[PDB]
């Protein structure tokens, strides 16, 4: 049967997903679960995924309750043979580590940010610590994008789509002033037809995380066309 | 060329990769880099890996940065046709969902914990906060052993092998008594001829975390 997709578009994660949905014009279903009042949490939802989290797949009797498994899994299923998971192994395992990368160490650093900012209000989190740690993603993705023009390689892959969302979340807060690689990068991925998807949720998580968290972002850091 | 691995045994990512390579008899060269002195920020490291972090994997022009990365390549270079990464879809996105169960979740959860007691003392930890936020990954472990005798289905795949090193460290802090399935589950990965591969890091671990933290693990 067609694909479920439980899903906030406030999640960097989950807009990754609607990305490749779109750019692979799948047939799925939509379901929302409202990350910012718990549903979460709702019986039914800890029963399909006990980690609480979005984006959470349905498909068939498969259960995928990560980005990074729901954007293989969908290049697999949808994109067989393609170049977003490459066929050759050393390419694959370089999205593939771009991907952890992606997990591990943007998005967890980007997720300490703004829990913090929920849960302790804008003007008493410590936002210098968290721009060090951010703006050290920012230095290693510059570092990466030296050597090609997409995340992974000269062709765009599902890393580009997992990074581009949290990149684009950080960036509400960070400025990309000293970082011409990336801004080549981010100017490019915001021509795919494709990041359309990633516009909505962007814009709701600003107004969500403004009113949550009593502030304003500053204007002047996004990046737009 | 055979894979270079940069590893300290005391973290618990390194451990499961060191458990895959006594599992598949891998030869690799190992390279220690000591977390507890900062040698990954040390500048050569640094270049290889800007995440400044182990195990770092080099094998030919293949440079890994992360565990579960590692393991997936050495399974699909050294275990083709094995059971630990399945071929079939399903079962390996199954698998797949594991092993970013352990990094996001799991792991996530057990470094924030272990990194404040470095930060702010043992004494000055919230531990509550660290137990309940642990306990729900031990509940949620014992959730997914309901239908089967290991993570992802009947048999060892990668998904034990990254989770239980991880699990073993939580477990230095919080004890299993109460979930059955997790409990049972980690006495048979402990029977193991791999899970040696599993202890000499894991003591190292207590050791460094007790003379760092000024404390004394409740399991020591």
Same mark, same amino acid.
């Given at each position: 049967?067609?694909? =479920?997709?439980?899903?906030?578009?406030?999640?960097?994660? !989950?807009?990754s /997903?609607?990305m490749l &949905?779109?750019?692979?014009?799948?047939?799925?279903?939509?379901?929302?679960?409202?990350?910012?009042?718990?549903? $979460?949490?709702?019986?039914?939802?800890?029963?399909?995924?006990?980690?609480?989290?979005?984006?959470?797949?349905?498909?068939?009797? @498969?259960?995928?309750?990560?980005?990074?498994? =729901?954007? &293989?899994?969908?290049?697999?299923?949808?994109? *067989?043979?393609?170049?977003?998971?490459?066929?050759?192994?050393?390419?694959?395992?370089? !999205?593939?580590?771009?991907?952890?990368?992606? /997990?591990?160490?943007?998005?967890?650093?980007?997720?300490?940010?703004?829990?913090?900012?929920?849960?302790?209000?804008?003007?008493? !989190?410590?936002?210098?610590?968290?721009?060090?740690?951010?703006?050290?993603?920012? =230095? =290693?993705?510059?570092?990466? @994008? *030296?050597?090609?023009?997409?995340?992974?390689?000269?062709?765009?892959?599902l890393?580009d789509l997992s &990074?581009v969302?949290?990149?684009?979340? !950080?960036?509400?807060?960070?400025?990309?002033?000293?970082?011409?690689?990336?801004?080549?990068?981010?100017?490019?991925? $915001?021509?795919?037809?494709?990041?359309?998807?990633? /516009?909505?949720?962007?814009?709701?998580?600003?107004?969500?995380?403004?009113?949550?968290?009593?502030? $304003?972002?500053?204007?002047?850091?996004?990046?737009?066309?």
């Amino acid at each position: 049967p067609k694909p =479920i997709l439980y899903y906030d578009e406030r999640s960097p994660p !989950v807009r990754s /997903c609607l990305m490749l &949905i779109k750019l692979l014009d799948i047939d799925v279903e939509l379901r929302f679960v409202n990350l910012f009042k718990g549903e $979460q949490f709702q019986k039914d939802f800890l029963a399909l995924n006990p980690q609480h989290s979005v984006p959470t797949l349905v498909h068939g009797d @498969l259960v995928l309750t990560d980005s990074h498994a =729901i954007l &293989i899994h969908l290049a697999e299923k949808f994109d *067989e043979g393609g170049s977003l998971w490459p066929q050759e192994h050393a390419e694959r395992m370089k !999205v593939l580590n771009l991907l952890l990368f992606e /997990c591990s160490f943007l998005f967890r650093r980007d997720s300490d940010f703004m829990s913090a900012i929920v849960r302790q209000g804008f003007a008493n !989190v410590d936002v210098a610590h968290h721009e060090r740690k951010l703006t050290e993603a920012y =230095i =290693i993705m510059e570092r990466y @994008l *030296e050597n090609s023009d997409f995340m992974a390689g000269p062709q765009l892959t599902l890393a580009d789509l997992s &990074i581009v969302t949290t990149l684009s979340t !950080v960036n509400l807060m960070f400025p990309l002033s000293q970082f011409p690689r990336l801004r080549r990068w981010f100017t490019a991925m $915001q021509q795919l037809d494709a990041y359309e998807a990633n /516009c909505s949720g962007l814009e709701k998580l600003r107004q969500t995380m403004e009113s949550v968290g009593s502030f $304003q972002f500053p204007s002047s850091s996004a990046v737009v066309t």
